[PDB]
Amino acid sequence: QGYAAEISARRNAMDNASKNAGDMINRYSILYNRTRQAVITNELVDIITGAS
């Protein structure tokens, strides 16, 4: 009964873990896009100021 219980609690635990991983991915997927936009803008500010 302990073996069954630990398997079930190792199936629900990793479920919660994977869903928390999904939420963290959905946050870092916004942080990433923000950094992407910032990087492009600033690289181009540098290029323009060099070209002025």
Partner: protein
């Protein structure tokens, strides 16, 4: 006409000098009588010394300095009216279908000024499309903007053709399609599909006017095709008094062409790389799609999202205008539910009890809750089996699946491929039918009776047909 001479050629930018001291106005169209067809240039700036800086609508190769240029006396003018129906037009208003001239009596400029505040519609209203899922769970606004999402296999072109046919039958309104910066092969596919469906008929009354810019065209052309299609739509509005659909595919390419033109004209690029004029350039186009006392222009716009970022300036500025969204998904097609509209990711600002009414809003809300709960338990349903549910959750699932296949609809355009007769479903009938399903009045009818029937009055006959079988 007032004659000038070219002085500089730097890519798609051409500077013209006008010695007579009678200069062309900004956004006016100059044309050079080159071999292999005359070339149109649009005035972008007045630089001084009687010199005007312009953007070319076609390749500038072969231009000599000192080449003669004529001022057309107005902006790019395009033909309008019935004659444009069933024909392919370029940005500068020429026939590229090679079936001859468009012998329209009128020509109108594409740089029209949008209607005044005093001429707007004071209250919102729905453009009944005949498609159950849209008209119920995400209705399209009259005079509004509708964003269509999805790529291949999801039936986008058939959806467009069905919108055209339904509007032409219910509302009598013609339609205009603009391919802005998309692939040429896909436009030929659309042309042949439209000939087979029956929305283009070279020997009769066509329903849709085609304007086709494409990737091969310079950025200055892509930046203006939409205004040509918009002018045809506006002419069908203001003169004939119709409710006219305007398809744009793709709008991100309008934004991108604007960024390219800005970069070429020397303007300092803004945020992630778009033109500083982004919001105003989008507005000058979108705010002409609006309802007036004469009629309404309603726009269906394909909206590509760079890097899947709904926060890239182009998506953001587009979404700021959109009144509705319709998401076509491969997943809903794998379930066989054509026209594949995701009833839960689609949305509309006009789905409010003030606009549609409570009779409608209650049905829509209940339907979305049913499907949302079904989706919210759509895994344990497989693990534990449908029998392990609560009886109430079981009933909600039986309603959900039945509704899900009741959102299916056969299209009259697809008849020539699917062989099934196509149907309209009016808004009254759709709302009443889904209320009847929600109240359980047709629980005892098997699921398959809801697949591609139309209204509930046909669910009846299909239940009887299954009974015979």
């Amino acid at each position: 006409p007032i004659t000038g001479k070219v002085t500089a050629v730097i890519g798609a930018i051409v500077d013209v000098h006008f010695e007579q001291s009678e200069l062309p106005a900004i956004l006016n169209a100059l044309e050079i009588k080159t071999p292999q067809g005359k070339l149109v240039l649009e005035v972008a700036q007045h630089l001084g010394e009687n010199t005007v800086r312009t953007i070319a609508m076609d390749g500038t190769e072969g231009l000599v300095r000192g080449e003669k240029v004529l001022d057309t006396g107005g902006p790019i003018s395009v033909p309008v009216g019935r004659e444009t129906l069933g024909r392919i037009i370029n940005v500068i208003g020429e026939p590229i279908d090679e079936r001859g001239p468009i012998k329209s009596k009128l020509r109108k400029p594409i740089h029209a000024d949008p209607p005044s505040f005093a001429e707007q519609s004071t209250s919102a209203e729905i453009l009944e499309t005949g498609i159950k899922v849209v008209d119920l769970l995400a209705p399209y606004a009259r005079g509004g903007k509708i964003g269509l999402f999805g790529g291949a296999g999801v039936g986008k072109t058939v959806f467009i053709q069905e919108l055209i046919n339904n509007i032409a039958k219910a509302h009598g309104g013609f339609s205009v399609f603009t391919g802005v910066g998309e692939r040429t092969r896909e436009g030929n596919d659309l042309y042949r599909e439209m000939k087979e469906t029956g929305v283009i008929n070279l020997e009769g009354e066509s329903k849709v006017a085609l304007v086709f810019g494409q990737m091969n065209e310079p950025p200055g052309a892509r930046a203006r095709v939409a205004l040509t299609g918009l002018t045809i739509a506006e002419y069908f509005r203001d003169e004939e008094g119709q409710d006219v659909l305007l398809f744009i595919d793709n709008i991100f390419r309008f934004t991108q062409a604007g960024s390219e033109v800005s970069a070429l004209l020397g303007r300092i690029p803004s945020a992630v790389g778009y033109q500083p004029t982004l919001a105003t350039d989008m507005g000058l186009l979108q705010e002409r799609i609006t309802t007036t006392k004469k009629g309404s222009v309603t726009s269906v716009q394909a909206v590509y999202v760079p890097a899947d970022d709904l926060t890239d300036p182009a998506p953001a500025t587009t979404f700021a205008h959109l009144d509705a969204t319709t998401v076509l998904s491969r997943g809903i097609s794998e379930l066989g539910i054509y026209p594949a509209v995701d009833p839960l990711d689609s949305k509309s600002r006009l789905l409010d009890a003030a606009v549609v009414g409570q009779e409608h809003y209650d049905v829509a809300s209940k339907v979305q809750e049913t499907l949302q709960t079904y989706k919210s338990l759509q895994d344990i349903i497989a693990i534990l089996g449908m029998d392990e549910l609560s009886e109430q959750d079981k009933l909600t699932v039986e309603r959900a699946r039945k509704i899900q296949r009741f959102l299916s609809q056969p299209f009259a355009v697809a008849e020539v491929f699917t062989g099934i007769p196509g149907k309209l479903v009016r808004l009254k009938d759709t709302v009443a039918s889904f209320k009847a399903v929600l109240e359980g009045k047709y629980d005892n009818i098997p699921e398959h009776a809801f697949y591609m029937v139309g209204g509930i009055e046909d669910v009846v006959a299909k239940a009887e047909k299954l009974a015979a079988e």
